[PDB]
Design an enzyme around this catalytic site. Sequence first.
Site, short mmCIF file in Angstrom:
data_model
loop_
_atom_site.label_atom_id
_atom_site.label_comp_id
_atom_site.label_asym_id
_atom_site.label_seq_id
_atom_site.Cartn_x
_atom_site.Cartn_y
_atom_site.Cartn_z
N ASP B 110 -16.90 4.11 -0.45
CA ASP B 110 -15.58 4.13 -1.24
C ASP B 110 -15.76 3.78 -2.76
O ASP B 110 -16.77 3.52 -3.15
CB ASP B 110 -14.58 3.48 -0.51
CG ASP B 110 -14.74 1.82 -0.78
OD1 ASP B 110 -15.33 1.33 -1.40
OD2 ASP B 110 -13.70 1.14 -0.23
N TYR B 360 14.46 -10.85 2.97
CA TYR B 360 16.02 -11.09 2.96
C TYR B 360 16.68 -9.69 2.28
O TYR B 360 17.96 -9.79 2.73
CB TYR B 360 16.58 -12.34 2.68
CG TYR B 360 16.28 -13.53 3.55
CD1 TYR B 360 16.34 -13.59 4.74
CD2 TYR B 360 15.52 -14.55 2.68
CE1 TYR B 360 16.20 -14.43 5.62
CE2 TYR B 360 15.24 -15.66 3.60
CZ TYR B 360 15.49 -15.53 5.08
OH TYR B 360 15.05 -16.65 5.90
#
Lengths: 731, 731
Positions: B110, B360
């Site tokens: 890669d 949240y």
Amino acid sequence: RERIIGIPKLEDANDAGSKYSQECTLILTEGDSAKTSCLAGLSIVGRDKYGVFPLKGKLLNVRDASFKQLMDNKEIQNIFRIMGLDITDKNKDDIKGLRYGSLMIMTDQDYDGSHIKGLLINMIHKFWPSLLKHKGFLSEFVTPIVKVQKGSQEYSFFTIAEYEQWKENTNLLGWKIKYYKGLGTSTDREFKQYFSDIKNHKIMFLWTGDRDGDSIDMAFSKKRIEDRKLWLQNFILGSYVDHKEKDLSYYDFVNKELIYYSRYDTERSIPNIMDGWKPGQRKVLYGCFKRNLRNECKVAQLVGYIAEHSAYHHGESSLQQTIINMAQTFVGSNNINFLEPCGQFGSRKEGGKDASAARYIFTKLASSTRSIFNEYDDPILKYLNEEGQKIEPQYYIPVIPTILVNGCEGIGTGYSSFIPNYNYKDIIDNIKRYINKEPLIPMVPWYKDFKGRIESNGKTGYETIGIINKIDNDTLEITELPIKKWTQDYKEFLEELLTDEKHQLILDYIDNSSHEDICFTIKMDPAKLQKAEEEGLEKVFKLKSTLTTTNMTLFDPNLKLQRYSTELDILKEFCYQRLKAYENRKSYLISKLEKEKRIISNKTKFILAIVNNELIVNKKKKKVLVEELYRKGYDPYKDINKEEIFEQELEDNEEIIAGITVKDYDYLLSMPIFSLTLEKVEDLLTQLKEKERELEILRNITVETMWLKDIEKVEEAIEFQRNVELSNREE
Amino acid sequence: RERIIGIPKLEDANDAGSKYSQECTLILTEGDSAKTSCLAGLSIVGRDKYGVFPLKGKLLNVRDASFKQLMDNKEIQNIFRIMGLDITDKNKDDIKGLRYGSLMIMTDQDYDGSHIKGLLINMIHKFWPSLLKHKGFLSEFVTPIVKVQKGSQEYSFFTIAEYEQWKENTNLLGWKIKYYKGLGTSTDREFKQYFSDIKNHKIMFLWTGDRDGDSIDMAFSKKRIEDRKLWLQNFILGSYVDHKEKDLSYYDFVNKELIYYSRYDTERSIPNIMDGWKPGQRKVLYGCFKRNLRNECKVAQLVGYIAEHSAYHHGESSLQQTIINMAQTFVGSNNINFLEPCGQFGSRKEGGKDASAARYIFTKLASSTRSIFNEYDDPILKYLNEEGQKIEPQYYIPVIPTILVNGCEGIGTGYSSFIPNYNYKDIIDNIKRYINKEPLIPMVPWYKDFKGRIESNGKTGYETIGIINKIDNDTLEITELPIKKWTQDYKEFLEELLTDEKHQLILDYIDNSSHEDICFTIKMDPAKLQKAEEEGLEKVFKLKSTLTTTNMTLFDPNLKLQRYSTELDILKEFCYQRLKAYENRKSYLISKLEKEKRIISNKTKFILAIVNNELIVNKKKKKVLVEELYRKGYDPYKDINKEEIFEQELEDNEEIIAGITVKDYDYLLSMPIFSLTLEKVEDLLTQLKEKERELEILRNITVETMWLKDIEKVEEAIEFQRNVELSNREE
């Protein structure tokens, strides 16, 4: 007038430090984000009387802190300057002349936020204990825990208990439901509404005697650890703070809210007896079952899936590591890995630290896992609910006690646990002895692929010993290390033996240890070698390790921490619970089979009636056909479908008669036209005979036979998985 | 014999530093994990001749590095000791007496691994350039890029091009396919196989002249940046290294492999003209479309979903931030947010830094997003393939050029870009002018909810000016800040004005700025205030900012970096491409409608035939019925279903006649028995008339009419979204 110089993050009230100081309130928020939401609220109430200061992370624990730590702590020093308070004047009983006359703590309604509220109360109690007694001084911002909607008629519930009572007594239509644990969940508009009605979003802390102070000191003092252990043990598992009340005592906050934070680390670090899982691993296994991970996927993708579906909140790095640890097979790790290591998952060289990146390694359920965690058990477990999402269960109930198979090592603070690995065969023969009222046999710790010795030390546990041999008068060879001594650490130890700080014990060494085997060749002074032989080679070269059995600590089946004296006590408790779980599985399967049979019976009648030209469907009006199905005795689905409700799992419904709709018969009308073809009709007919035989057989089977049969399958699965590992190992 | 003291991580070959040194090979691996896999390989080949050393992270770039950095660099110093090499002796042309006679670099296949291979070559070239010319000195470990399986007949492809040629010419059965980019993907057993046949897993680096050296210096030198820019620009987009070859020149490695790493940062930091997206944001939008995120979900859950489905590799923190930035609506951020901020997503106070935790906050697609990114366009985009997974497209093609709506700011190294925000209305009237061959009008930068002035500076761009007013002779008030000057930074600037280091310019200030509005009240010496008025208040109080338009740099529609002189050049290129995209959409929709019509026609005939008693299904053998459907002229599905193949997206099939199976007619046999009822038959009949009218209308519509109609919908959607934002803002 008075003003503050050194604190850019402070949003000082206009009248703070003025002659109106007593009227002012200082709001302490959990983070800058909370402060921004607060300013949205203050654009309603105004900025004359309200100040805002954002807390960063978690406040210092002043009670345990050294003087130097206190002076050095800028956040606390700043809070002191903002308030006009300071340490030298303790005993202060009045609210003058402080810059602000009230303090309001604003946090997430979660454990960390509770811990923050506690830390602030801790600081005030430690420096100005008098101030807590002063009424109206400390309050907390509170929003509704749950908001529900149906068109109009919007309700907001401050207490979960209140919401549960509404939920139990209501059909959730189409009601839209949102939980509000974190402050971030609320929009700026919502904050404007809370501040429009601030009295109804404020809870005042109340001092109710010296027990409040003792509560705070018990929670935060370095010297009250045993009191804390007693406090954690005596906890009542339904305990919660009633937010409906405008007032909350410090003692009730500590005992019924802060305790959840206090006990959370133990919950994270110590596994349940029933499945041997810590909650994070259990989230991983639950995620794997939900998607049915029978084919390989990248660990990084699995990490994303678990984070979405299991509510894992400790970050990707810990989640990656949890999955990887569940896949490791090297000596000293899992006796039975329930995830397959498809790639480089690490080795004994570094104790798994040498695992490859999550992006390039694959995993899937190990071949034995679904036999051990039998899927027939999945529906009888108790699944947790987080903000309406159905997540992982309280625990799994495997066929055998996996906690003894793979052991555990846990450290929180105030509690730790160690359990050794054991032979699954010894475990299974103890289970068979439990079934037959035969005496249980004590088990010796056993580790897969370990070549050394394991023997009792006679007192606290067992000892594992590696292998070292004399080659000749100058040469030693080591071909096995004790359990959990990683190869690289040992190599470093031999290198330190080479240096004079260790008296040149060895002349030289060659290390040709592989990824999984041990090969050290050591060259020594012949006289030094002989003396070392007299001392004992295993001792000199540190080839022993200790498996202590005196602290086998687990959560019991009722979610309560216990120390089990022996592996037999663990086994017995597990067997009692598992035998009951088999009764629950049997009753569930019988109820499911009865429902399936009824569905089959209706489909059989429906197909036969069409195929025999008794029932005409072609070009029949649908309401006419539904009316006819109802009149002729077909069960609408709801009569067969007799179940805890998770919020996030939610030709017309126009009632024909009496209460029947078209949807009620979809299970029949939905069936493909292909069902009317001959082979399909024949198979359908076959299905009911097979369903009743299967049901009759299930009705008369005992739990002992069900268990014994599952144990048979588990033995086969473990042996197959092991044979595959061995075949892979061979050239 | 010779031995190494200070390097615990070294797995020294037994014969290194000996008289056999020339025969030894030192393997440099990317990480400890790679080293562990290598030792698995060496348990086959033996440990006499092979040494292993793990590289940590990325090697220092020695070419640019100061002498102090080189001495201070323990990893490089260690490599020098292990080899027996050092700086003082350059010019060395021989492989003696080095501890090892060969160097093998082992890395992921890669970009990062390529960068590591390049860094190692860079070091060798810099200190011992002579050594690169020496044949057999440097090699690279190579595994097959793809492994395929069908029962037996297992193939392994070293080159992707080879795999593509096999894939194109083969029906993937049931072939099982795995990519091997990272080393971690391979099992220890697989490593044993590679080392069993090491010659076929090794590529030798070859020196082919001084161009090789010039290539390496161009890649890594601090002084060759412009040469690097030319090199990046002249890149040929199909370029790849042929791993089939046993040899690879340094020049070919640099030009055809390393270049991918070299250009990756620019790819990450600079958006495409067509959708205004950087690749990470595009991964986010793609993920949102795939699950159809029309309902709210937590950002943290979205993060997990995107990480699984879009192949995002830069970690959860960056992904969280990318989603959050895509939802922000405050002044100076998005003119049109395509994600909705359901919660605290940050504000102008801190430029979005004050966003709440991902756990949240909720988000969903903004109401306008699917009108702007029209889903009819989804099937005509080019989707990338990563290791067999279908991920995000090369770019989206929105109805309007979103890059002008939200602008961009990008810094990589060697390339940057800035584009201002613009009014979508100005953009749309330029689009209508492009459609009508009317002259395009230059656009002035425009920012939603900004209350100050934007005016040309006459040279490089535009200036934005905030609002400051004289209240009285002692008092100033500021009610607007220039674009992208966050409130908290400005407040800190006023505070620094208070201190003498800035000559006590102001006496005092009160800041009552909200989360989204600006309110500073300033008290000054009256004479100082008057002098400041003469200097110009906006200049003194730094209430101006600059929008530079001279560096509007984007990837063009052909994936090539360009600098566009004006916003009109960007608009024109977008319009040309978009008009063509409408031709592609029209042709695709026509082909889809023709397929749907044919399916409807077959279902209509099948249902009518059963309902009219021409076709008998009841109790008919299935093969008999399939034979009859085929004989009577019903199309098997494969005749109607005339499509790039992504690997991870993969009553018997026994041929009745001639090539027909039962599955071929499932689309008919699958239809529910409910289809035979009257209303359902009537609707089915309705469906074909509607399908042909819709097809006829589509056939004769022009691309300009399709675009103009979509623009109409976009104007309505943007206005609705804005009106909702304003309604929410009001009390």
